[PDB]
Amino acid sequence: MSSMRAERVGEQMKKELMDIINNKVKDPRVGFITITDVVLTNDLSQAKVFLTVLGNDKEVENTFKALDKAKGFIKSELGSRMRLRIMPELMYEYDQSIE
């Protein structure tokens, strides 16, 4: 479940998503939102977006809801930055790997 195409598109989405989310979606009263990786399926139909977010357990959960609420806005801004015709479905995941 990782062709070279999928890895390359994921690096572009990582960069584009971090910009979109931090400069246009995020409440200024919360810290930066770090995207550590974007992992796509080979047909690019799904993207798992791994995240580092700052705060307590409820600030983490408040942040996930804001991003889910903004999914239409985020796919649209992403689609306007990439020749890709149909956007993947975006799934926001906490990055367990990091303590």
Numbering used by the authors: 1 to 99
What text appears in the publication on this structure?
One such assembly factor involved in small ribosomal subunit maturation is the ribosomal binding factor A (RbfA). In general, RbfA is a small, compact, single-domain protein with a molecular weight of 13–15 kDa. RbfA proteins have a KH-domain-(type II)-like fold which is characteristic of RNA- and ssDNA-binding proteins. The RbfA facilitates the correct folding of the functional core of rRNA and is required for 30S maturation and translation initiation.
The crystal structure of S. aureus RbfA consists of three α-helices and three β-strands in an α1-β1-β2-α2-α3-β3 order characteristic of RbfA homologs and other proteins with KH-domain (type II) organization. Three α-helices are located opposite three antiparallel β-strands, with the following amino acid composition: α1 (4–25), β1 (34–40), β2 (46–52), α2 (57–69), α3 (71–81), and β3 (89–94). The α2 and α3 helices are located at an angle (~120°) with strongly conserved Ala70 at the kink. This is the helix–kink–helix motif (hkh) of the KH-domain (the GXXG motif is presented by AXG in RbfA). Pairwise structure alignment of S. aureus RbfA with known structures of homologs revealed a high structural similarity with Cα-RMSD of 1.24 Å, 0.82 Å, 0.82 Å, 3.32 Å, and 1.22 Å for E. coli, T. thermophilus, H. influenzae, M. pneumonia, and T. maritima, respectively. RbfA consists mostly of hydrophobic amino acids, which form the hydrophobic core of the molecule between α-helices and the β-sheet. Analysis of the electrostatic surface potential map (at pH = 7.5, as this pH is favorable for ribosomes) revealed a negatively charged region covering the area between α2 and β3 towards β1 via the top of β3 followed by the C-terminus. The positively charged region goes along the outer side of α2 to an interhelical kink. The strong positively charged region is formed in between the α2/β3, β1/β2 linkers, and the N-terminus of the α1-helix. These features of RbfA organization ensure formation of an extensive interface for interacting with the 16S rRNA core of the 30S subunit.
